Amino acid sequence: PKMKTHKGAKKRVKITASGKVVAMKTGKRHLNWQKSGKEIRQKGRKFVLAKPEAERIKLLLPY
């Protein structure tokens, strides 16, 4: 009775204006040590998912 929004998702995914769904690239908080400078710059951006991306949206909706 009245769906609860999944907070785990809300806390780490943003649903874009057109429908797409973005989030940060994985592995970047401690994996490094000297990993290429190119690595961490590209791990700095965010991206779009696809099929889970559509699974994702369902976990929100009021959101």
Partner: protein, 97 residues
């Protein structure tokens, strides 16, 4: 039963503190395009009862729209819309706050 895709990670830092949610002024965007819809001396009063503001409080005119010549009170203006609206009229800013 493995890892979800919840391997992703909360960049959405600044997500909550105990009392949480610090009340503050909510500015609502409204362009000149839907502003040129009517005319006279548009103000927060008009826009709410107009179906454009809806008591969201705080008004900021901005950007895309053709500057209809007239007066218009608001809490804020876009640098861009501010110049367009000066090129055919005059407008004062918010009260105190």
């Amino acid at each position: 039963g493995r890892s979800t895709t919840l391997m992703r990670l909360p960049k959405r830092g600044m997500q909550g503190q105990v009392p949480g949610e610090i009340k503050r002024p909510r500015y609502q965007g409204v362009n000149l395009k839907d502003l040129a819809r009517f005319e006279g001396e548009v103000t927060p009063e008009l826009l709410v009862r107009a179906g454009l503001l809806k008591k969201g409080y705080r008004l900021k005119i901005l950007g895309e729209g053709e500057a209809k010549p007239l007066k218009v009170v608001a809490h804020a203006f876009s640098k861009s819309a501010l110049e367009k609206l000066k090129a055919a009229g005059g407008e004062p800013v918010l009260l105190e706050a």
